[PDB]
User: Which sequence fits this backbone?
């Protein structure tokens, strides 16, 4: 009965849950959906979407409303509800930083700018972001987080909670770093040796070592060390996997640090964050860029040999749903949609104007399909054998290289039969496909609004035979056969529309 | 267990109901919805709208169909039904005047123009309005009203009925005053001393004292004294608060008296009516002017230090619903929509072509929101601490000054998140906000189709902190907490859509 | 317990049913809806429409399928069903003529053109209409009709059946008369004395007496005498009222006889039919002319001092519904819509493409309204005191003279409140009003999509007072009060929309 | 209690089921709807459509997954379900050929191109079609088919299964014939004597006898003999009727053999297939040509004196539904729509994008109408006395010759009453009519979106009388009368809309 753990070796990764790889199919409630009196607007939405994991804020202001006086009653209530509604949990520690700011820190923290000081701009102004350099703020956050992880260990031997997110989009808007004297005395000092090593540099001060990027790298290092110390102390009580989430900078035309949240784990300081954070298992992007080229580039930059891809947040508008499968195709640990409840809040223009059964349906389709084979899909991801893709506007055909023997053509917006002319694509980009290689000649295949045409990748497989195309579902790891597709259903690839269908396809050659 | 009473001192007012301030959230049935056989088309509409007070006609013709033979059986039935359906009552005495005319007076009154004479025009014609100068008509109305108030005292110790409206839009169409000899002998006489005092004038006859306005002021005085005598005699039996309602003249381009109902409490004879009517607690406007500038000007003119604002009637078309909150913002006693039943009558073009759940929804939203905190809202109004505003077409932003420390920006038609560009306003003007100052740093806030952004009003509060933003409801005066809004839900003001939500917002500063 | 009877004296008429005047609010099933196995598609439509009288074919071919072998089992079944579904019946004897033809005569009649000969054209051709001159055909029809009326007397002491229609649109298409030798020997003879008397003519042969109209008048006389003899023999067994129905000729631009059904009771041979038919109580028009001027002219021509108006058939398209009230305004005996069942037959373009709750609603509204006061309305018609009108396209205002004291203005398509501008009319012509004078100052008033404004018709009533405007219903002749309309509901006339409402309006004058 | 049998003599044909002629009103499930776990998406669609016969694949790969190891469990389950849901079955043997290919043959067949060789092109390439010349493939298919028919005999004494289809669209895409040496040695040989006889030719080799068509005729003969041998061996175990289905070549502009499936029973090798296949009862077209002229021409070419017409497959788009009645008008054995289940597969553009109650309704209408008289309709077809027609775009009138005495005019898109102008046709071509001659003067008539006007075909019947027009249904062969249509319902022909109605019309003449 092992607890959840994150493993990563030689560029292959797994979130182990109950002793086997697990893929997070996640939903995050809105930021103020973290009280008993509002949960009856959370669970009905989850029942429609059907995530296997729900992200919920655990606010520092609610568990330590007065210093030393802890209250974990909402954690207790939430664990009971998640167990009743059959989901795992990822708890979000809203503390020193939530979207750069201290708004979720307790009254006795965020109103006391002397004991818990804010970042000071170069021009001398205090701004709405707590300085990472103050020992008092670190001590207070870590104490509450330690008490949190101690409580969790006592009341969750079921391991309902599988990961913790310490802080939420840490970083600073409105200044590249802290310019207070306390900060400057550290910025004037020598760059720590660990960072010199990891960055392949020569010793010196921050200004000497990093030049024009010293301010931003200093801030990223200082935030990273701050959260790493919290993660280390919490893991000493209850060593759940832990990750931080990034408010992104633009992948192609980023602004200046401070326009984006400086110091957060943005795509230019990933090495700094890895060096600062040996106790942080991964750096997760929060992706609200609906354009295909931007979204998929962010996925590629955060999927590294030293970083399992977890899309911790993404939009809940219907065009976002299709990005689930390409995310899983990077063989990370999963993907989560943000803003899933019926509280009538909307983060439009980032997300949907409303959350209801219609807006959730495109998301539920993928969650249902993956859930039909989640443990085999997760095993495949743990071995780097998952492939996934989403439809790009203006391109009705994609090619997926599977292995030496087979490839898959993905065609969007076509009939499930012979068609004349070039594939038109779906009227809106809504298609996706997901393929796991189970063995060299057998694949798990699902998709929607799309045709998947497996075909030979070499002369050795030119004489292709469909041996079986079994529709069915897995119970855990046991395959439950429904029917063998054949005839019209495989003559023009295998075609998916709007219902979740999993196909276990065994290929052969005639000899 | 005190009876209802109206208190007013130094420009602050309260309708005391069950020993505490009360705000009327009212609905008035149509003019012929005052019989047992039609009430099953009243209560289903009230169940949807959810008023806390219902206005119903009590017709002189129904309670004294023959002289001396009183019948209060409908009053009895109505009290039972209002108690069953959990509303308070305001009873409208349809007697000497209903919309200037005697149509609701009994057969033995309105067919006898000798004993109960009509106004005579300057040219000698009797018109459809009873003369205020006839002692017989005053005596007969007052007798029936006294018997009415005696009956009410006996059968309503519960105080279901909280106010009485003697007469209904008294005044005269088609003549500025009565020109009959009976009238002229009074018009030739000396202006009574009380009116000379209140009007800051020198003694004389009506023509000497008031000049070109003598005819209209004489008529207003004479009607005012007539109704005051009825109110005084009724209050001697059962001293419920009492008010009269005004058919309005145009605020900017009024016609001549007689085109509008001359002698009624129009905005140019309010002092005359106050002098004539020490036993009439307030002069209430009936507002069927949907244009923002006209509607809000009428509110300002009738909200005086000597006159608590009560909007006794207003339209039931959807654009009217938003005027509830600016009305309450004048710290009067409430607001009532006219024409609320399912009898299939329509007073379009003044009001809605139909009354159903769709047309009532915009009204129900505000009634539900205010009802969630009605007694605290009424306490705030009794202290002059209520603020309210409605959306004006072409203006997407309003500013509300709250106190020395805080103000509120009201923004219409915007996302509940960051938006680029100037606020567009709602496509139709439908937004409103209502704010009560509970203490210098704590406010009750609700609105719809609107964003409320509290912000510093002085250098002393520049370092603004949201201490709590508690969503919840009051049970009487006891606050029932649901959740604390934070994060996305307060980063861009607090945003309201189409559901009733009450926020108790405590502000702080970091130090 | 009297049987139904028709009375007519000095231009005033009544269908007496159960000892008092009765107004037929009728529905006729389609022509093949006269068998047990199809009645379950009749009664559900009647339940929606709510007629008080249903017309049903009784086919000669079904009650005498072989000569001498009578079968009245469907009559028995139908009486049971009409009693169960609470309607009266008018039975249509489909025999020698149905729409000019013998198609409903038994096999042994309509296939035997020797014993039962057809009309012969001038050029020698037999056409699809039976000759009225053959004694064999008269004898056979009359025998079956006598057996029919004998059976009815035995099995209907309840008087479910209130009238009989002998034949159905008798007349001849394709020839003005019979030109066979049998016919010519009668045409050559002397005009019978009774017809010479009634037509104010001098004796002679048909050609001498009537000139160019001799052929058509001869045919009308001969058909009239034929049916009169059947009616006389049937009435001798069971003297129910009896009427014949007319396929109309054009009121303004009629064709030639034979294009229209020559010999039928068309508007130019009404005197001939009255002379030929002393045992036929009335001549009823079948009106499928939707244009206002044509429809109302037909009503005027068939409403005579010697002819009570009964609209035996009219269209079931929605524009026809409004013609009910002007029909009743001629103080005849009622009005019936044709084609009322759910068999999925349509007589479009004459009638509606479908029969369902939507197409029936405009008809049901009037039937419900009249049924709320049917016996008082019928009493008023029996005295010539009913007034009715329907909306004409392009005319939004009509005036109804009621008596010396009062008139009514009918205004179409206006608000139920003050409106600026000229009345626009309803977008389609759908309005109607019905007014019964109960006494000189009291009226029964109903309407739909219309305003009724009673107003003085003389200087004596200039000082008009609404004494009562009672909404309610009658149970038999007992008035059941609901409420008194007043205020807004009578300030702009009394306004009717889409629900059935009956108002008993007592007018007064102030003195 | 006879088993099903096919009889054909002198150009008249019958499928005898339970001892009497039977007309297949068929539905075929999709190609992968042949497993227990998917049948719950078959029967709900059949319940809506209401076929009397369902076609289901029986796949060689499922009944002999390993050689010698038979498994008929799905056959057993399917028989139980068809009996429960009250349909007959036609089982489709998916074996050596399914749409030219071996995809439904077992693993040990289709992956072994040595023992079970594919067709070789002229240029030397193996293509996806099994060669008919290999004795091993014939032996293996026939063995499995024999075991299949043996099993069926044991478990289906109820005769739920009425026909078998050996193979499915046999033929070859991509080559006119096999060019392998094995094939060429047969092609070089002498044409068998039976084919020389039937083709009215002189002896010789294939190239000598048939010239430019030798390749295609050789292939058709070789496939025909292959399947005939299977049919003969299966019939020896259980002699159910058997048929083959044809992937069609274009009727007017066919491509080359190999573009269409060469060797299949295309319209140019019907004589070859008749000569090769004395044990194959008929050659059935699969018609996915929606254009009227192409569809009806295919019907005419496959309806031969030596070939009963069975439309084994046709489209499930709504325009196809109307082709049922003209198919039955060729006096064959029935008609079946392809793709009838709720699995969410679509063979659009050939068929409908979706299968649901709306898309099935036009098909269900005809199935319900024919089912109301199926055994009399089948008796009439067995005697060549069925007549049927469908609406052609641009032609609103058709004439059907019935016999010497009567004809029927079919008019599309007109009212059920008199209309002015030329018939417009239905907006889309949707009408059809079906007429059985029961005796010289009595007909069974049904249709939809159409008028049927019976009229004289000779001077002897000029004096036409409708004797009876009985609406009703048959229970087996017993007529159950509902009503006699007359009057309006027969004055303008008999008119059909969207509900199933069967009329038994007896015609007479008056004398």
Assistant:
């Amino acid at each position: 009965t092992p607890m959840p753990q994150f493993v990563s070796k030689d560029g292959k990764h797994a979130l182990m849950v109950d002793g086997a790889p697990f893929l997070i199919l996640g939903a995050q409630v809105n930021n103020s959906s973290n009280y008993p009196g509002i949960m009856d607007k959370v669970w009905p939405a989850m029942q429609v979407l059907g995530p296997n994991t729900v992200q919920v804020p655990i606010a520092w202001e609610q568990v330590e409303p007065e210093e030393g006086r802890f209250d974990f009653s909402f954690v207790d209530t939430l664990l009971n509800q998640a167990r009743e509604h059959k989901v795992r949990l990822v708890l979000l520690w809203f503390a020193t930083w939530k979207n750069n700011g201290p708004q979720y820190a307790p009254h006795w923290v965020k109103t006391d700018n002397q004991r818990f000081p804010r970042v000071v701009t170069r021009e001398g102004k205090s701004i709405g972001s707590l300085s990472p350099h103050a020992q008092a703020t670190l001590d207070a956050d870590r104490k509450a987080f330690v008490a949190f992880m101690q409580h969790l260990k006592k009341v969750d031997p079921q391991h309902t909670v599988i990961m913790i997110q310490p802080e939420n989009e840490a970083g600073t808007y409105g200044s590249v770093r802290d310019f207070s004297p306390m900060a400057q005395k550290l910025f004037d000092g020598q760059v720590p040796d660990e960072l010199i090593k990891r960055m392949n540099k020569q010793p010196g001060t921050w200004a000497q070592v990093f030049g024009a990027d010293a301010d931003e790298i200093f801030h990223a290092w200082s935030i990273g060390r701050y959260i790493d110390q919290i993660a280390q102390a919490g893991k000493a009580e209850y060593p759940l996997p832990m990750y931080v989430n990034a408010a992104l900078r633009g992948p192609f035309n980023p602004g200046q640090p401070g326009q984006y949240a400086s110091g957060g784990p943005t795509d230019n300081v990933l090495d700094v964050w890895k060096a600062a954070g040996p106790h942080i298992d991964l750096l997760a992007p929060d992706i609200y860029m609906p354009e295909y080229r931007m979204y998929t580039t962010v996925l590629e930059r955060y999927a590294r040999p030293d970083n399992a891809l977890f899309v911790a947040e993404t939009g809940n508008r219907p065009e976002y749903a299709r990005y689930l499968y390409p995310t899983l195709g990077h063989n990370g640990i999963g993907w989560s949609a943000f803003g899933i409840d019926y509280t009538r809040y909307s983060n439009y223009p980032l997300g949907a104007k409303h959350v209801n059964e219609e807006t959730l349906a495109p998301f539920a389709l993928g969650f249902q399909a993956v859930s039909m084979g989640m443990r085999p899909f997760a095993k495949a991801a743990s071995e780097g054998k998952l492939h996934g893709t989403a439809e790009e506007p203006g391109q009705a055909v994609q090619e997926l290289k599977l292995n030496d023997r087979w490839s898959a053509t993905i065609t969007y917006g076509v009939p499930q039969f012979w068609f004349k002319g070039e594939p038109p694509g779906n009227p809106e980009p809504i298609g996706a496909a997901l393929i796991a290689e189970l063995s060299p000649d057998e694949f798990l295949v699902t998709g929607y609004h799309a045709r998947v045409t497996l075909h030979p990748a070499s002369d050795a497989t030119a004489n292709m035979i469909y041996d079986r195309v079994e529709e069915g579902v897995y119970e855990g790891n046991d395959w439950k056969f429904q029917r063998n597709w054949n005839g019209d259903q495989t003559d023009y690839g295998v075609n998916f529309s709007s219902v979740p269908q999993l196909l276990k396809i065994k290929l052969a050659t005639y000899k």
User: Anything to note?
Assistant: Residues 1-371 of chain C form one domain. The first strand of chain C starts at residue 5 and ends at 9. The radius of gyration of chain C is 24 Å.
